[PDB]
Scaffold this active site. Structure first.
Site, short mmCIF file in Angstrom:
data_model
loop_
_atom_site.label_atom_id
_atom_site.label_comp_id
_atom_site.label_asym_id
_atom_site.label_seq_id
_atom_site.Cartn_x
_atom_site.Cartn_y
_atom_site.Cartn_z
N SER A 11 0.97 -1.08 -0.03
CA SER A 11 0.21 -0.15 -0.09
C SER A 11 1.00 1.12 -0.15
O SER A 11 1.45 1.63 -0.91
CB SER A 11 -0.97 -0.10 1.08
OG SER A 11 -2.11 0.90 1.06
N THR A 12 0.80 1.93 0.77
CA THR A 12 1.58 3.22 1.30
C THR A 12 3.13 2.87 1.01
O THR A 12 3.69 2.16 1.88
CB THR A 12 1.48 3.95 2.56
OG1 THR A 12 0.01 4.07 2.81
CG2 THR A 12 2.15 5.38 2.58
N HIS A 38 -2.43 -1.39 -3.47
CA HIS A 38 -3.70 -0.67 -3.11
C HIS A 38 -3.50 0.87 -3.87
O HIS A 38 -2.53 1.31 -3.67
CB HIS A 38 -3.93 -0.34 -1.61
CG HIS A 38 -4.06 -1.36 -0.63
ND1 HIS A 38 -4.29 -1.19 0.71
CD2 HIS A 38 -4.24 -2.72 -1.15
CE1 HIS A 38 -4.42 -2.48 1.17
NE2 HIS A 38 -4.44 -3.52 0.25
N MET A 131 -0.57 1.01 5.39
CA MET A 131 -1.34 1.17 6.25
C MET A 131 -2.37 0.10 6.29
O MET A 131 -2.61 -0.69 5.38
CB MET A 131 -2.03 2.55 6.34
CG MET A 131 -1.28 3.82 6.48
SD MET A 131 -2.43 5.31 6.68
CE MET A 131 -1.30 6.39 7.31
N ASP A 134 -4.58 -5.27 5.91
CA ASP A 134 -4.69 -6.03 4.60
C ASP A 134 -3.35 -7.06 4.53
O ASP A 134 -2.18 -6.58 4.57
CB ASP A 134 -4.89 -5.36 3.39
CG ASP A 134 -5.22 -6.09 2.08
OD1 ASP A 134 -5.93 -7.16 2.25
OD2 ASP A 134 -4.79 -5.81 1.00
#
Length: 189
Positions: A11-12, A38, A131, A134
């Site tokens: 993600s991030t 993501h 973050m 998941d």
């Protein structure tokens, strides 16, 4: 179905860590790689191009009904959960439109659930920077089937959330900074 599979969740700061991983894998890497990053709809394709330009492996967006093959790195497209299905000894992708897992879709948990059930002990999960949680439930499934799990070390993470959540459950077999992940993958396959 033969061989192993690598399913990566990020993600991030995902792209930044993937830059230290994907470009450092040989063209003949024997296991197909699936990446669930993501990102808002319409941006996953940029990631594919970014990594394809710096890698020996062929990086592209996963397509519905496409056969999962070694030597490729598939980026999950937006708006759908990326599934995997075994048919006549081969593995194919499928775009599922079920509910968001978190307020996220695709969610790496969905892909890992499917991959683990098919590849079982030959499943390798890699949970990178990001973050949320998941990848945690997906890591559970991987371990339940005897697979292997790698969590990204805080050193190279922009956000040490996703990997930390995996580690706190005790699902991580390895905790490695992004740059050491390619090396570990090469020796596990």
């Amino acid at each position: 179905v033969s061989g192993k599979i690598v399913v990566i969740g990020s993600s991030t700061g995902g792209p930044r860590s993937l830059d230290m991983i994907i470009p450092n894998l040989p063209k003949n890497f024997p296991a197909p790689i699936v990446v669930v990053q993501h990102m808002p709809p319409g941006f996953t394709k940029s990631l594919a191009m970014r990594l394809d330009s710096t890698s020996e492996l062929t990086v592209k967006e996963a397509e519905d009904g496409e056969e999962v093959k070694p030597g490729f790195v598939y980026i999950a497209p937006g708006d759908f959960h990326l599934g995997l299905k075994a048919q006549n000894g081969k593995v194919f992708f499928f775009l599922d439109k079920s509910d968001k897992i978190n307020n996220v879709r695709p969610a790496v948990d969905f892909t890992l659930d499917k991959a683990a059930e098919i590849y079982k002990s030959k499943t390798i999960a890699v949970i990178l920077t990001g973050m949320g949680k998941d990848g945690t439930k997906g890591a559970f499934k991987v371990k339940f089937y005897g697979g292997t799990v790698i969590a990204e070390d805080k050193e190279t993470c922009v956000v040490f959330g996703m990997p930390k959540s995996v580690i706190e459950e005790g699902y991580a077999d390895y905790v490695l900074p992004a740059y050491k992940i390619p090396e570990k993958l090469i020796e596990l396959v």
